[PDB]
């Protein structure tokens, strides 16, 4: 019909207009690494983890935001793509705190896992790290913002899904902080979801804190009875 033909590592894919490079890649079962992109949130393009090389294109593109063009050959595992991923991961980890043993995210952390899968194995950062103060936003969501990677996922969720415009960024540069700028509680009927979308241990569950690790839990798929939504 109106579909256009693109290529993922030379494999032909038919996609509808407006499909992004990331979506075209996942049409063939390839998941592009991501931090800021979420398919139920608006596109941000700030984390730069999804950078990928297009054949015969000198500059890599942000797969989460870039619409795919007809005839494009996306190289998901080329040298350029891998080096871009390693550089971005190095930048993300330069100021990140060495909190994994005491961080509740450990074992189900996208930062940890994508560092293991797409980053290098050592450090060459020889400076001191930044440390930011913590924000109190209620008794449900525990905040430790030194772990924040500035994804903007919580802000976009609060604005778009929950309809609450209380979250934002203050400052600029390395000093940019995610918060409310005032002592304010983010008490919404949907607030707890910001724990799950947060890729890191910056936002965690306060009732759940310190009690379990992800690998020891057994998962039972069931239905909620707290309302009639099911």
């Amino acid at each position: 019909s109106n579909l256009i033909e693109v290529f993922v590592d030379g494999q032909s894919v038919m996609v509808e207009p407006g499909t992004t490079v990331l979506q075209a890649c996942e049409k063939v079962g390839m998941q592009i690494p991501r931090f800021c992109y979420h398919e139920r949130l608006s596109v941000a393009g700030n984390c730069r983890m999804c950078l990928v090389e297009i054949e015969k294109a000198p500059k890599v593109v942000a797969a989460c935001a870039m619409p795919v063009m007809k005839g494009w050959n996306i190289l998901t595992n080329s040298e350029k793509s891998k080096k871009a991923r390693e550089g971005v991961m190095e930048f993300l980890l330069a100021n990140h705190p060495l909190d994994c043993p005491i961080c509740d995210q450990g074992g189900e952390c996208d930062l940890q896992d994508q560092s293991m899968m797409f980053g290098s194995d050592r450090s060459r950062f020889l400076e001191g790290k930044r440390a930011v103060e913590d924000k109190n936003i209620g008794p449900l969501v525990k905040t430790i913002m030194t772990r924040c990677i500035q994804c903007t996922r919580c802000i976009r969720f609060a604005s778009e899904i929950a309809g609450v415009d209380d979250l934002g960024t203050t400052g600029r540069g390395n000093d940019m902080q995610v918060g409310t700028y005032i002592e304010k509680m983010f008490m919404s009927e949907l607030s707890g979801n910001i724990i799950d979308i947060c890729p890191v241990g910056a936002l965690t569950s306060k009732p759940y804190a310190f009690t379990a690790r992800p690998w020891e839990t057994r998962k039972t798929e069931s239905i909620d009875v707290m309302d009639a939504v099911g």
Binding site: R48, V88, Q150, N174
Partner: protein
């Protein structure tokens, strides 16, 4: 003899910004006595296609620093409307260190910018122009507002502009202390009352711009030469400079020169000719020259041996492993701590980063720390190569070109002054035992 091989010695009759120094009246009457607002109605009645053709023939490239062909860029708005209004945004942020050219245009030749706004908006079929000026230029913005009021009272802009039957408005919006807001998408976001964070492209502004409408962002110097280009024709502008490097250019010479100044000169003038003719020469003679940053803080420095024969155009400076940029020449003599100056530039970029994307937000601060250590000599020589790699990681992986502008000066310093860094590290290791 066609195909000029020597460039420079620009004449006063061929200069565009004739009140650069504010020695004549900057009001409407003085501008009209100098050739402004002359037969603007006939230029508008020629139609957008004729104006765009004149700009394309003129060979004008973007004076904001990137040098994109102006006619091609303005042609993107020649599409039929889709129900949204169309807008021209004039970039008067002027944040680049060593660059003060726009300020003089605004304060001393505001009517040139206003008529350029009218002509460019007609060519692009834009309803109004928004001029974004940095908030530190309060008196310049007030002078611009006075000139706009004069043009409104004389019927030159507004309803039935110049009697041509075309309605055009000129608005001035003031920024509040942000260098990133000179980036065109960050400027658009700033106008809409948000943080000055650049948008990803695509979409380009001609598709989705200010208020989500088709928009063209153009540098003030680019805008202010268009009415003169239309009046004298594309060919007259084309003759000056090398091929594909046409026209005249405003140069700001600062640093270690005897007479730092802003001057107008032909495009492909040699750098040595410019410095020794208009700026009075290097402090202490030409042999005292250590390095020159030719196009503002974002262009890599070049040592003295390169500055002697290099030409001040886009292509020549690209061949010299640098850029024309804003044509802001910062001169440093042999008494300069070359590491410390570049470290100060890196600190500037650290304080100006908007913080949106990971490579700039983290790596520019990282490079600032490394350069602060390099000034003292605290590091080891291996770290030099490490620093180079860090810059390469940052470059091309960021939403906007501030990352490029932070990576390039470090690369220039490493390329041309690695022995100085190693020598400083040797001294630090010696004295601290």
């Amino acid at each position: 003899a066609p195909k000029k091989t020597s460039f420079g010695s620009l004449k006063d009759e061929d200069r565009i910004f004739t009140n650069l120094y504010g020695r004549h009246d900057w009001r409407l009457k003085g501008a009209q006595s100098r050739g402004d607002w002359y037969k603007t109605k006939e230029i508008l009645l020629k139609g957008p296609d004729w104006i765009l053709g004149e700009v394309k023939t003129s060979g004008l490239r973007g004076r904001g620093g990137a040098g994109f062909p102006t006619g091609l860029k303005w042609s993107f708005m020649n599409k039929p409307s889709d129900g949204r209004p169309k807008y021209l945004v004039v970039n008067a942020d002027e944040g680049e260190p060593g660059t003060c050219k726009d300020r003089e245009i605004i304060r001393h030749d505001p009517h040139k910018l206003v008529e350029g706004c009218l002509v460019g908006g007609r060519a692009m079929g834009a309803r109004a122009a928004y001029i974004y000026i940095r908030g530190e230029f309060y008196n310049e913005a007030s002078n611009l507002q006075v000139a706009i009021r004069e043009a409104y009272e004389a019927g030159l802009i507004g309803k039935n502009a110049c009697g041509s039957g075309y309605d055009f408005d000129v608005f001035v919006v003031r920024g509040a202390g942000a260098y990133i807001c000179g980036e065109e998408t960050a400027l658009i976001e700033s106008i809409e009352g948000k943080q000055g964070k650049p948008r990803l492209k695509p979409p380009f502004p001609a598709d989705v711009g200010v208020f989500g409408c088709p928009t063209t962002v153009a540098n003030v110097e680019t805008v202010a030469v268009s009415p003169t280009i239309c009046r004298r024709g594309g060919a007259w502008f084309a003759s000056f400079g090398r091929e594909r490097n046409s026209g005249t250019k405003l140069f700001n010479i600062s640093g270690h020169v005897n007479h730092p100044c802003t001057v107008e000169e032909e495009m492909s003038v040699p750098l040595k000719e410019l410095i020794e003719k208009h700026a009075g020469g290097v402090i202490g003679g030409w042999d005292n020259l250590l390095a020159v940053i030719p196009g503002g803080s974002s262009t890599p420095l070049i040592p003295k041996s390169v500055c002697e024969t290099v030409l001040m155009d886009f292509d020549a400076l690209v061949q010299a492993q640098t850029g024309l940029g804003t044509a802001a020449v910062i001169v440093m003599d042999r008494s300069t701590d070359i590491v410390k100056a570049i470290a100060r530039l890196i600190e500037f970029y650290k304080h100006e980063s908007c913080g949106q994307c990971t490579p700039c937000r983290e790596g520019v601060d990282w490079m600032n720390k490394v350069m602060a250590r390099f000034v003292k000599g605290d590091a080891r020589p291996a770290e030099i190569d490490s620093l180079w790699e860090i810059s390469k990681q940052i470059e091309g992986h960021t939403i906007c070109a501030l990352g490029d502008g932070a990576a390039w000066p470090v690369q220039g310093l490493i390329r041309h002054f690695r022995p100085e860094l190693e020598e400083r590290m040797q001294q630090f290791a010696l004295q601290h035992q």
